[PDB]
Design a protein around this nucleic acid. Sequence first.
DNA 1: TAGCCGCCAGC
DNA 2: GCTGGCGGCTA
Length: 63
Amino acid sequence: KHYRGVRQRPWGKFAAEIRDPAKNGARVWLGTFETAEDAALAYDRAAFRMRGSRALLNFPLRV
DNA sequence: TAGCCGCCAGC
DNA sequence: GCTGGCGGCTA
């Protein structure tokens, strides 16, 4: 699978970005993560912090 | 190898 | 118009 923010780097790792509209479309590089699901979980909290609530995520813990 | 650039495509 | 993702480049 692929994920929101999550970008395969060609040696086989997963970066995670989010774009921040309050900073007028800035990227915010959440880091790099060994697994796609941990890159995607980094995005999960990063979108939640800029939105505060009501977000479109990789692991919505409400379901 | 990671991150940033910068752009492009997609939504 | 914005966000995500591409993709490559450079650090």
